[PDB]
């Protein structure tokens, strides 16, 4: 395009290590400044 | 917890070592920790497919 | 080295701050058109077979250049982050 580059969103390694951690029965959740839930999965987590 | 408290301090030495170590895990659970019944499985998560393609 | 770098480390409390400022400036320098700038009038960056860095080669150099003037403003929490982008897209076309 001639744009800068789309770094952010979430890192691969991170979502992959969340789910790969979830495959053993570990509840690994992500928190805000104040200890709050945070949807790492790009609005795709919804059922 | 209380049982272990007494088990820890009151019996003489050479014993309460393991009561200490046991206490650690009990405290761990009752801290910002969870309920120990999930320590065993009856639901198994399946890893996505492309991660095991 | 690059044009007047000591003067630019003199401009900030943290070396790294300069990097963040420059980066973000070049970013908006590109995003909201390239007429974002505060300095074009006469004698700004240039290149060599026609002459036009007066349109769009290197953005961050433009940043360093502008910043070398006391024209831009940098600061921890100057303006509410949202109304910022609103205002930028509203004032300047070029999509």
Swiss-Prot record, chain A:
It comes from the Bacteria. Belongs to the RNA polymerase beta chain family. DNA-dependent RNA polymerase catalyzes the transcription of DNA into RNA using the four ribonucleoside triphosphates as substrates. The RNAP catalytic core consists of 2 alpha, 1 beta, 1 beta' and 1 omega subunit. When a sigma factor is associated with the core the holoenzyme is formed, which can initiate transcription. This is DNA-directed RNA polymerase subunit beta. It comes from Thermus thermophilus (strain ATCC 27634 / DSM 579 / HB8). The chain holds residues 1072 to 1118 of 1119 of the full protein.
Curated annotation (Swiss-Prot), chain B:
The RNAP catalytic core consists of 2 alpha, 1 beta, 1 beta' and 1 omega subunit. When a sigma factor is associated with the core the holoenzyme is formed, which can initiate transcription. Belongs to the RNA polymerase beta' chain family. DNA-dependent RNA polymerase catalyzes the transcription of DNA into RNA using the four ribonucleoside triphosphates as substrates. This is DNA-directed RNA polymerase subunit beta'. The lineage of its organism: Bacteria, Thermotogati, Deinococcota, Deinococci, Thermales. The gene is rpoC.
Curated annotation (Swiss-Prot), chain C:
It comes from the Bacteria. It holds the Pfam family RNA_pol_Rpb6. It is an enzyme of class 2 (transferase). SMART domains: RNA_pol_Rpb6. Its EC number is 2.7.7.6. SUPFAM superfamilies: RPB6/omega subunit-like. Keywords: DNA-directed RNA polymerase, Nucleotidyltransferase, Transcription, Transferase. The keyword Acetylation does not apply. One of its GO terms (molecular function) is DNA binding. One of its GO terms (cellular component) is DNA-directed RNA polymerase complex. The keyword Transferase applies. One of its GO terms (biological process) is DNA-templated transcription. It catalyses: RNA(n) + a ribonucleoside 5'-triphosphate = RNA(n+1) + diphosphate. Belongs to the RNA polymerase subunit omega family. NCBIfam families: rpoZ (TIGR00690). The RNAP catalytic core consists of 2 alpha, 1 beta, 1 beta' and 1 omega subunit. When a sigma factor is associated with the core the holoenzyme is formed, which can initiate transcription. Promotes RNA polymerase assembly. Latches the N- and C-terminal regions of the beta' subunit thereby facilitating its interaction with the beta and alpha subunits. This is DNA-directed RNA polymerase subunit omega. It comes from Thermus thermophilus (strain ATCC 27634 / DSM 579 / HB8).
């Amino acid at each position: 395009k001639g744009e800068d580059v789309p770094e952010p969103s979430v890192p691969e390694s991170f979502r992959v290590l969340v789910k790969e951690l979830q495959a053993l029965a570990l509840d690994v959740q992500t928190l805000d400044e104040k200890d709050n839930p945070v949807d790492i999965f790009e609005g795709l987590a919804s059922k | 917890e209380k049982e272990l408290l007494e088990e820890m301090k009151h019996p003489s030495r050479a014993r309460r070592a393991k009561a200490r170590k046991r206490l650690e895990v009990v405290r761990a659970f009752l801290d910002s920790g969870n309920r120990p019944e999930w320590m065993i499985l009856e639901a198994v998560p399946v890893l996505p497919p492309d991660l095991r393609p | 080295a690059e044009p007047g770098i000591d003067k630019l480390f003199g401009m900030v409390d943290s070396k790294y701050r300069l990097t963040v400022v420059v980066a973000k400036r070049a970013q908006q320098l590109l995003r909201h058109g390239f007429k974002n700038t505060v300095l074009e009038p006469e004698e700004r960056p240039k290149m060599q077979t026609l002459e036009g860095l007066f349109d769009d080669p290197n953005a961050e150099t433009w940043a360093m250049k502008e910043l070398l003037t006391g024209r831009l403003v940098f600061g921890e929490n100057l303006v509410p982050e949202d109304r910022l982008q609103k205002e930028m897209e509203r004032i300047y076309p070029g999509e």
